Design a protein around this ligand. Sequence first.
Ligand SMILES: C[S@@+](CC[C@H](N)C(=O)[O-])C[C@H]1O[C@@H](n2cnc3c(N)ncnc32)[C@H](O)[C@@H]1O
Length: 236
Amino acid sequence: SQNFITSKHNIDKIMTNIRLNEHDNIFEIGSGKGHFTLELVQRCNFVTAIEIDHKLCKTTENKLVDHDNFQVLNKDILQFKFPKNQSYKIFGNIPYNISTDIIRKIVFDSIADEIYLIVEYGFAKRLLNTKRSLALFLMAEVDISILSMVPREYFHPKPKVNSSLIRLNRKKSRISHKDKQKYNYFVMKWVNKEYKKIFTKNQFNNSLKHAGIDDLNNISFEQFLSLFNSYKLFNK
Ligand SMILES: C[S@@+](CC[C@H](N)C(=O)[O-])C[C@H]1O[C@@H](n2cnc3c(N)ncnc32)[C@H](O)[C@@H]1O
């Protein structure tokens, strides 16, 4: 529920892979007791911490007592409205129960160009899984990277599984706003293998050969992009 990583020794190691500089404005998701928040303010330009728990916001403010370049807002990340004309990045050690909602919220309803998250090892593995609809919807907006492993012992209470530190970098969308609908439809039908609803036996054939897809259990996002494009061509 509310896991905390409080060992300075361990926080420094995790910060080692987090390349954020003095000039970046940061929005942290779930500052908790403020352990990461304190390293962020000393590292970055400004830190807007968003914590839904009113008590924790206090603890966080207390921890940053000696700093002035932050702000702790007691709100729900899911409801929060990120800036629209600003360069900012995001960091967060987030709750597993809402990982999906949080990651969609910050990728699709945020314009942060760089996003650093600590999530469960398996959850992370599926974000890079081109057989899953979530991965496909995200890869059109960001590049995903697993930077390292965060041992469960680093957490408390000690969770059953290990977690991973992932990075998400925004890029020029691979899908035009015009194809919003189509892509969404195509994505769903493809992850469900309802091929018939999106391709004729031949279109499907040619599309795979054209895409270079030899094995349906191992397609790159690039190859999938190709499928969606052949799909568009075959239908107006
Ligand atoms: C795994 S903990 C991370 C705690 C802190 N970052 C740390 O590592 O010590 C998740 C944190 O996010 C907060 N949280 C959970 N759901 C939230 C939401 N919808 N909006 C904002 N914060 C939320 C929890 O209260 C908690 O502080």
